[PDB]
């Protein structure tokens, strides 16, 4: 206790995160609303933001796969955590206008 | 430090308001994540080395 500050014991803790191909199991405290389909809505699936139209899908996800990508290399298929299904994300109607 | 422990935590909700009042002063340095938004994420596996 009479040592200098550059000698006193310091407790150190290191937290290492893992974002792997599996349902996260350390999700933070937040509520969960119901599920709505065939309507351009916002969403938050396991902390992943985005707006789109959740539609029923038919692609056969592998047993341990969690997310999915497209030929354009972006998120388009999501497996719902509470109820294990496969949902497709597609932007709602959109286009240019002319007068 | 020569035989540092490792603790694995899984299958639990993690509220981080606990670790805000643990000492009068401490260093909280995060690489890749900001502490304020850290509550609103979903890490898959988190390991603690003490």
């Amino acid at each position, epitope marked *: *206790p009479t040592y*200098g*500050v*550059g000698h006193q014991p310091y407790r150190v803790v290191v937290l290492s995160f893992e974002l792997l191909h599996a349902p996260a199991t350390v999700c933070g405290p937040k509520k969960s609303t119901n599920l709505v389909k065939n309507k351009c809505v916002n969403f938050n699936f396991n902390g992943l933001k985005g707006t789109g139209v959740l539609t029923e899908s038919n692609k056969k996800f592998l047993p341990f796969q969690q997310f999915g990508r497209d030929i354009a290399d972006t998120t388009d298929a999501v497996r719902d955590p509470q109820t294990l299904e496969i949902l497709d994300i597609t932007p709602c109607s959109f286009g240019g206008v002319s007068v | 430090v020569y035989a540092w422990n490792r603790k694995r935590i899984s299958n639990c909700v993690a509220d981080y308001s606990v670790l805000y009042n643990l000492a*009068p*002063f*401490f*260093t*909280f340095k995060c690489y890749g994540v900001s502490p304020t938004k850290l509550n609103d994420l979903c890490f898959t596996n988190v390991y603690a080395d003490s």
Partner: nanobody
Amino acid sequence: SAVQLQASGGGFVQPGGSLRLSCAASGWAETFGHMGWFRQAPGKEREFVSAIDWWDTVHYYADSVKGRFTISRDNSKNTVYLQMNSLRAEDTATYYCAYWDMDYLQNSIPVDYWGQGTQVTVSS
């Protein structure tokens, strides 16, 4: 980061005397950085006086107060202390303890946080 600085000390003194100032820090910051004191004369600009690393290894002092002001650190209270003597009339000013949140100090221009002004007055 969220750091709160509590300052203590100050008052009215006689020229050439000694007085008492101390600053404590609380909260959480990015790293263990430097800590210093800043002087504001009435009607003048705010200038630094000194800067001490957290681990009390290297000290930096201004040319105008070298050999007359010193700063040290507690060993069981996490509160920085400073001592002075031979106070002159120009020392009547407002002092603020400031925390610099980087490991290695380069210059006093970028200041992170500021404390409540402690006014010290010296006269006959």
